């Protein structure tokens, strides 16, 4: 049925179907890859927030973080970036108690930007697929229907029997286009929402730690 | 957010074939 | 009429409508739930502002607020956090005139963010529904039309009368898709505008109270 | 003839027509009210600017402004809010001019926000209506085509008098949709331009007054 | 930047309606 | 041909077919008027910088610019305003170095905003025309076809020969609408880019002059 | 097939096809030109970051860079404009620890603005093509349908054999319009996304260098 129509198609229709099949495969692979990373990031963030609010001294936390060298991810990195700069400035620039807070905030911001850039890779491709596929299907269908009109115009009379085959091979392309297009929008929206939640959590933690440092500096 | 009704066009043209087969 | 067409439809066409019906039900439930909460928040904010600008001294108002500790919502929570931070910071290192103001502003921003986060739940589901429904409807329509013409092609020397019911029962899918898509798109913008108005109100209150604190600290 | 076609239609298209008529009426009312408020505002602003740059002393302007308290609108508010702040801090300690300038500017920004919010009240509804009407028209058209196809499939060798109702029912929906869509789309931009011009005038006045205050403070 | 489709859809619908009405 | 079709149209279609001509005439006039002004501004902007950077004591240039009072446009106005504010503010207070630079920088944004406002007139009209025209065309077409069907249905003749001219004459509104729409969009897109290109040079010149003043502020 | 319809078409249809083909050629040429430059810029930035962090002294890097005064591009320029400022101002007034940081930052901002302006050329043409292209295919289709209908009205035979070729020739305009429209719409977003990453990298490098100079200044 469908295989016969695929075989009977010309070269342009075959190419325009293969493009969409490849697009669908790539989209599914991207979704499967990204979900696990987002889940792991969420779990690590929650665990570290609980550990930080447990009530252990900050020197012990810094020692434990240094025990893992520079291989840190998520909020652990931010807490490592600020505390390193703060202690460095307090030794030298003891005169100005306001510059240390600016240094700590500047150190935290760059790190946070780096993790947020890391998390959101390969996402806009799904939006491109979901915004482009239907037009490709429409172009294929228009080509097929125009060919059908040209073929029909030759004879002075024809029934539905000799115009039936064109319809199925015309609609196959748009069916495949919709099938490829549907899941991309859902994946796009869900992944964007998860990234936003992580971003707000990071911002809240950064502001809390900056407040603690500001209280400690002016004494 | 947005409404996309592009594939509807693909339907309409198809119907336009039928009335060109045996009718004006 | 419509019931007979639904009964005589194929399995996929019949199944493709239950999803859209469920989506519509969920959308209506979410809208009804969100509206009441937003209205209550607006009323509470107005009442608290009217009470605050009446002329009662701030100490008694703070005592009343601390009576309920932290089970507060919105402007009263912001005022409580700001006042507590102000008194705590001024108790120790009152030499600085600007550090106290900066700390109070930071605390108020922190407390406002976690309320604006709470007010904005379940909204993106409406956008997802409104962006995904028409594609499903059109896929159902395309499948129905293709199946009808394929079944027709077997019969030799047919007429339009046998064909018409297929398209008649096929267009129901796209009708239902548009019906389920429109209101979800309408409600999104209204809810966003209400959230924006509440955010503006909170920002104005925070700025006024920061100015009031600044006048006291600067002397 | 055209109305007789409406009188013999189904219930759903009647509901669609009623909804679109209500939308049109609301749009017209909003346009009429906004075109008067935004016209009065500009004349008030221009008159105040001419009076301010006429050459009279600032103290006389302040006395006249405080005479008509609780009814100021527009730039008259911005001059009144900032100036009263400037004399409040200057008599407090008579040092730190930057604090005086910042306190003067903050009140002016706060006052400007209220006026802009008051001027931008009922605009997004027009945009929503203009964006949403054509799809309701499309829903009506799809229903009409469905009824026409059912009528063709009902009786063998159908005549024109039995296919006419669906074709008649299809066109009115599109006509009403476009008729309701156009004026809202025009009025949206027409009002946004006026709002932008008023905002620019307010910003220029605020900057010039701040410049005068800054020059006087550091002498 | 963006592609508008409503005019094409309207024109196609009108053409379908006229061809459907002309053929009895 | 076309004249007969226009003559056979109804009153409403004829009335519609004049707004779409007025729109085209207005758009062409606006484009022709704006191009010359933008070209003159670009030539003057490119001609002043060469004189500024050729190497000449700035006092002589300022004295020469004093001659053409109330006639300066472009970067000359910015230069004059900044220099005048700098000289006036330096004479009174000679202690604070940063205040002089702050005042000189503030004195230039007002002028830049004024010229940018001057150079950006009558573009939203082009945007509105380009966005509106096709819908009016479609409304005219729908109305004409409704009248054609009503006229056809009364008589018993059902052949195409007496209904074809009506459909032929009812399809001119859409062509006129698109013909009016295209140039407006093209001109809008081009003029916005030209304005942005003009703005960037002013921004760069402002920053460079602030930089050259900063070094003289501290000696 | 296509050639027969192209030859049998009127003059306006042929002109429309020629215009659309020219637009497609221009779009493809612009895409090919831009991709190579956008890739080379990223390669150079990645190459320079490692050399900066490799551990060589800054003075020797400055000595190496000063031999290529008129061939620098990218981050190197942002470096070169910075150091030269920091050397000069520090020779005059080294007492102020905050003036030198701003004096260094201004030059880096200017250079970054110039580089970003240079990177984005010819992009808006793609958006103009994407917005304009379908409006010409619509004109072609409408003209073809009008000619077909008037030809049918002229003759005395209500046959489909002479209306089929006109409808067949009508759809070529829409096909070619979509073909010209799609790739430009893809490339516009692709190139904007490409530019944003380079913007982020430049901002991060500027922040890190500003931090290093800030740390050095106070000591």
Numbering used by the authors:
A (entry chain A), C (entry chain B), D (entry chain C), F (entry chain D), G (entry chain E): 5 to 223
B (entry chain F), E (entry chain G): 14 to 37
From the paper:
The Tol-Pal system is essential for maintaining outer membrane (OM) stability during cell division in Gram-negative bacteria. The inner membrane complex TolQRA harnesses proton motive force (PMF) to establish transient interactions within the periplasm, thereby coordinating cell envelope remodeling and facilitating OM invagination at division sites. TolQ forms a pentameric structure similar to that of MotA and ExbB, exhibiting a volcano-like configuration with a narrow periplasmic end and a wider cytoplasmic base. The pentameric TolQ encapsulates the dimeric TolR through its N-terminal transmembrane helices at the periplasmic end.
To explore the dynamic motion of the TolQRA complex, we aimed to capture its distinct states using styrene-maleic acid (SMA) polymers. Two distinct structural classes with high resolutions were determined at 2.92 and 3.28 Å, respectively, with one class lacking density for TolA (hereafter TolQ5R2) and the other displaying density corresponding to one copy of TolA (hereafter TolQ5R2A). The TolA molecule bound in TolQ5R2A is positioned consistently with its location on the TolQ1 subunit in the nanodisc TolQ5R2A3 structure. The superimposition of the TolQ5R2 and TolQ5R2A structures onto the TolQ5R2A3 structure shows root-mean-square deviation (RMSD) values of 1.31 and 2.52 Å, respectively, based on the alignment of 217 Cα atoms. The superimposition of these structures, utilizing the TolR dimer as a reference, revealed that the TolQ5R2 structure slightly rotated compared to TolQ5R2A3. The morphing transition between TolQ5R2A3 and TolQ5R2 demonstrates a prominent shutter-like rotation in the cytoplasmic termini of TolQ in relation to the central TolR dimer. When viewed from the cytoplasmic side of the pentamer, TolQ5R2A3 features an oval-shaped cytoplasmic opening, TolQ5R2 presents a round opening, and TolQ5R2A displays a split between TolQ1 and TolQ5 as well as between TolQ3 and TolQ4. Conformational variation primarily arises from the cytoplasmic half of the TM2 helix, which contains three arginine residues (R110, R113, and R118). These residues form salt bridges with glutamic acid residues (E211 or E212) and hydrogen bonds with H218 in TM3 of adjacent TolQ subunits. To investigate how D23 protonation in TolR influences conformational dynamics during TolQRA rotation, we performed MD simulations on different protonation states of the SMA-captured intermediate TolQ5R2 structure. Protonation of D23 in both TolR(A) and TolR(B) enhanced structural stability, as reflected by consistent TolR_D23–TolQ_T178 distances in the simulations.
